[PDB]
Write a protein that binds this ligand. Structure first.
Ligand SMILES: *[C@@H]1O[C@H](CO)[C@@H](O[C@@H]2O[C@H](CO)[C@@H](O[C@@H]3O[C@H](CO[C@H]4O[C@H](CO)[C@@H](O)[C@H](O)[C@@H]4O)[C@@H](O)[C@H](O)[C@@H]3O)[C@H](O)[C@H]2NC(C)=O)[C@H](O)[C@H]1NC(C)=O
Ligand SMILES: *[C@@H]1O[C@H](CO)[C@@H](O[C@@H]2O[C@H](CO)[C@@H](O[C@@H]3O[C@H](CO)[C@@H](O)[C@H](O)[C@@H]3O)[C@H](O)[C@H]2NC(C)=O)[C@H](O)[C@H]1NC(C)=O
Ligand SMILES: *[C@@H]1O[C@H](CO)[C@@H](O[C@@H]2O[C@H](CO)[C@@H](O[C@@H]3O[C@H](CO)[C@@H](O)[C@H](O)[C@@H]3O)[C@H](O)[C@H]2NC(C)=O)[C@H](O)[C@H]1NC(C)=O
Ligand SMILES: *[C@@H]1O[C@H](CO)[C@@H](O[C@@H]2O[C@H](CO)[C@@H](O)[C@H](O)[C@H]2NC(C)=O)[C@H](O)[C@H]1NC(C)=O
Ligand SMILES: *[C@@H]1O[C@H](CO)[C@@H](O[C@@H]2O[C@H](CO)[C@@H](O)[C@H](O)[C@H]2NC(C)=O)[C@H](O)[C@H]1NC(C)=O
Ligand SMILES: *[C@@H]1O[C@H](CO)[C@@H](O)[C@H](O)[C@H]1NC(C)=O
Ligand SMILES: *[C@@H]1O[C@H](CO)[C@@H](O)[C@H](O)[C@H]1NC(C)=O
Ligand SMILES: *[C@@H]1O[C@H](CO)[C@@H](O)[C@H](O)[C@H]1NC(C)=O
Ligand SMILES: *[C@@H]1O[C@H](CO)[C@@H](O)[C@H](O)[C@H]1NC(C)=O
Ligand SMILES: [Ca+2]
Ligand SMILES: [Ca+2]
Lengths: 340, 339
């Protein structure tokens, strides 16, 4: 063995070719809410994900406001902020359309669930991850980085600075809390990609991962969501080969982060940054995690130690330059795991 | 002399894929042309009265827009251009919703300067620009196209045709006219716009509607809103014509000159009588493939000359003939009479 690598894994559900599953939130009742980036910007609802073949249904298509959805984060219980924009095409390598990013709310405290525009954010480059402040959950932080001049045919790859916005979902007011940080930046060390990708908050520690340098970072944040001076990022862990996407603390209060990387998932010590691949490439179970994108732990007695992993690729490619989109959601049972 | 078809000549032809969309004539008489594709640019035609005049890229507006549509002069030799991001440079591509903007090209400086005047995300598709003659730092801007533009247009639900007032000094803007059948399209002429070009003469705002062949006008107050009850006056109707944009004149003459379906028309302001002067409908019927706008020369060499922009390679015989390939031409109107 219990806890041996590769950890036990199963497939919950697989979407058709062209469906890009990008992020995940777990509801208080334990069901999953998944964002998709293509073919449409939607949220899908996975019911009783601890069962063998859970039912899944479209919860809402956000076409009214966006072509694509990216990140999702819960605010007050069973309300969720999602982010997205218009995109030049549903193709996997398409850029966004500049100035079309927005934050929208999906309110599952009403049935049917209610949606609304929370904030157009034309000044952001590309909104990515969403993390509510634990003590003030109506306030969210949002990560932001991609090409500075997105166009129909991308030629100028000048990256925008990685940065993090504060959004007050009650008023729609937003402001930058952090920008101009090498730790949020990309230099395309890993090819065309982003710098800062997922963000998650635990207590008063804001964590993020960098897709281009394999760094995991954190910084202490004040009650208003701005960093505590001198606002210098603390390195948690560096695995230079890994194209980190998003992550989850836990389970429960284990001293660990669980992070999606390059066709694999890793456990990472919060104390000292020791990193161990637990499934996918680098283990004998090396075809089962093609292009994972995010992960979050279950929230019921059935699955508190189960890490639910989204992914967007049909098979493991020989090349990151010609992937094939076909999304999925899987489950990794972390019970008994130990770094060594 | 003055006979139809009026004398015409080509000043310059652009490569295939180049869509020349509108025109402003500078105080010194040179032409400033907007392009929609391949890029959003202004081209500068020097001494257009000469036989084969020189032309050059004045500014590429890529920093803010994939495409430019209309252009209108504000204070002397400053110009507002409008444009947005588009899903592709394909001739049939929709715009990307909420990316429209008005920018300024300042030709008083050397080299010409540019700035962003207003992002206008509430607008649907900005089209024609016309400054107020008594307050040229205020411009009216027409606006109509699909209500829900997308990567592959399937819902053709049209936006209401309307007109914005933009204060170029503050960047503030508000609607002054909306909810008018006369600015609307029902696609009587196929996928198109409703209100297209706008121009202002004195305190009279004119516009053409591309879908119903109508020419209209309303009186406007000094603050730029129409005089109540702001009912459009029908000026002329030619049902078959896909009007795009137009020019008053030349000089004192009681006429508008309007680009139509592969043709140009002179139109009486007093009574709306409409005479095709070049293109389809005259014996010289291939020389105006898809004209887009027109304005008169402003020098002693060409104040009776109507410079006409266009975006089509040739008059399309069938709907899959349409080849984008733009141009600028000149129609000498000297001696013309309605007859
Ligand atoms: C000029 O063209 C406009 C664009 O087509 C015309 O506007 C449309 O007019 C129709 C007929 O009245 C309206 O249809 C009704 O809409 C209501 C609901 O309206 C509200 O919700 C819609 C949907 O979000 C929204 O678009 C409206 O602004 C309202 O907030 C329905 O309950 C009726 O059953 C009926 O369908 C259209 O709603 C309206 N569209 C827009 C975008 O305004 C306009 O009538 C034309 N004017 C003239 C003089 O011909
Ligand atoms: C780097 O940090 C990790 C944690 O992120 C450290 O691993 C943890 O080490 C502790 C020992 O201090 C382990 O606790 C022991 O667990 C066993 C098994 O249940 C229990 O019987 C013992 O009484 C004790 O509690 C803990 O399991 C382990 N955590 C994980 C996730 O592996 C690691 O030691 C640190 N490395 C260095 C070099 O300090
Ligand atoms: C419809 O309206 C148009 C004007 O938009 C009329 O054409 C204009 O008719 C006037 C007659 O009052 C012409 O002006 C007169 O002719 C000459 C001008 O050199 C002069 O001898 C007179 O003193 C007076 O100015 C004007 O030239 C003419 N405009 C054009 C462009 O032809 C037209 O008669 C009206 N009706 C129809 C059926 O067209
Ligand atoms: C979904 O996409 C996958 C991957 O592109 C398709 O699998 C390929 O199918 C072709 C045959 O058309 C084979 O030549 C390739 O070797 C397959 N690739 C892999 C990795 O197996 C799959 O057929 C598509 N599914 C559907 C229903 O269209
Ligand atoms: C993070 O990335 C941004 C964007 O690449 C960097 O900002 C650029 O810095 C160079 C040199 O200092 C300037 O020439 C560019 O004009 C800047 N671009 C923008 C968009 O501001 C920034 O220096 C990086 N920060 C760190 C700490 O590495
Ligand atoms: C995606 O959204 C569009 C518009 O809302 C719709 O036509 C289509 O059926 C949706 N689903 C797809 C493409 O799977
Ligand atoms: C421009 O388009 C026309 C229309 O199809 C075509 O005949 C012509 O060859 C093109 N010009 C080129 C390819 O240089
Ligand atoms: C369009 O503009 C870009 C610069 O923004 C330039 O690289 C490209 O060559 C232009 N296209 C054409 C056809 O000139
Ligand atoms: C132009 O005129 C000629 C001569 O009558 C005719 O054959 C041709 O069809 C006309 N073309 C158009 C586009 O009207
Ligand atoms: Ca991501
Ligand atoms: Ca036009």
């Amino acid at each position: 063995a219990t806890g041996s690598v590769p950890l036990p894994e199963r497939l919950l559900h697989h979407w058709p070719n062209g469906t890009w599953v990008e992020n995940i939130a777990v509801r208080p009742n334990g069901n999953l809410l998944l964002t998709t980036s293509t073919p449409n910007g939607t949220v899908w609802h996975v019911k009783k994900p601890w069962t063998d073949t859970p039912e899944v249904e479209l919860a809402y298509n956000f076409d009214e406001w966006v072509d694509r959805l990216i990140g999702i984060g819960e605010t007050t219980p069973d309300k969720y902020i999602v982010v997205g924009s218009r995109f030049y095409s549903p193709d996997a390598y398409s850029s966004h359309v500049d100035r079309t990013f927005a934050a929208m709310e999906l309110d599952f405290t009403k049935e049917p669930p209610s949606t609304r525009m929370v904030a157009w954010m034309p000044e952001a480059e590309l909104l990515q991850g969403v993390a509510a402040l634990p003590w003030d959950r109506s306030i969210v932080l949002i990560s932001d980085q991609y090409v500075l001049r997105p166009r129909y045919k991308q030629v100028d790859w000048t990256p925008s600075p990685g940065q993090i916005w504060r959004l007050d979902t009650k008023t729609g007011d937003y402001e930058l809390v952090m920008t101009d940080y090498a730790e949020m930046n990309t230099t395309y060390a890993h090819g065309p990609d982003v710098g800062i990708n997922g963000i998650r908050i635990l207590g008063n520690e804001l964590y993020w991962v960098n897709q281009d340098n394999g760094g995991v970072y954190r910084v202490e944040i004040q009650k208003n969501g701005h960093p505590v001076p001198p606002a210098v990022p603390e390195v948690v862990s560096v695995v230079e080969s890994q194209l980190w996407d998003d992550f989850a603390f836990g389970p429960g209060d284990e001293d660990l982060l669980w992070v999606t990387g390059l066709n694999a998932v890793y456990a990472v010590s919060k104390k000292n940054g020791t990193a161990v691949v637990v499934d996918g490439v680098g283990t004998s179970n090396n075809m089962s995690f093609p292009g994972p994108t995010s992960c979050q732990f279950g929230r019921t007695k059935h699955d508190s130690n189960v890490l639910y992993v989204t992914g967007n690729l049909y098979s493991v490619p020989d090349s990151l330059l010609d992937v094939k989109i076909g999304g999925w959601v899987r489950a990794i049972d972390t019970t008994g795991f130990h770094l060594h």
